[PDB]
Design a protein around this nucleic acid. Structure first.
Length: 54
RNA sequence: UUUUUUUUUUUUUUUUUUUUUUUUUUCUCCUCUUUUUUUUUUUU
């Protein structure tokens, strides 16, 4: 479980960039379930990162 | 005997206003028959 988190943070970027395409076309049927997936993907272990964040 | 790298949730907020129910039409139009008009009066 070292490459899973990197694959996750790679997936979340394309899901964040598909919103601009769904908005450009004008088809919010997919842009709504994609927004729900985007908010459904953000966990807390992903953002742990390093020790002295703050 | 299969390594290394590919960022992410738009920025903004400390704007004034001194009125008052309604609201706006419909034309001129042959009234039939015993009468002058009876009448005080008293019992409420």
């Amino acid at each position: 479980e070292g490459l899973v988190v990197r694959c996750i943070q790679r997936l979340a970027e394309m899901c964040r960039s598909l919103r601009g395409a769904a908005r450009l076309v004008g088809e919010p049927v997919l842009g709504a379930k994609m927004e729900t997936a985007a908010t459904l993907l953000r966990r807390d272990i992903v953002f742990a990162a390093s020790l002295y964040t703050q």
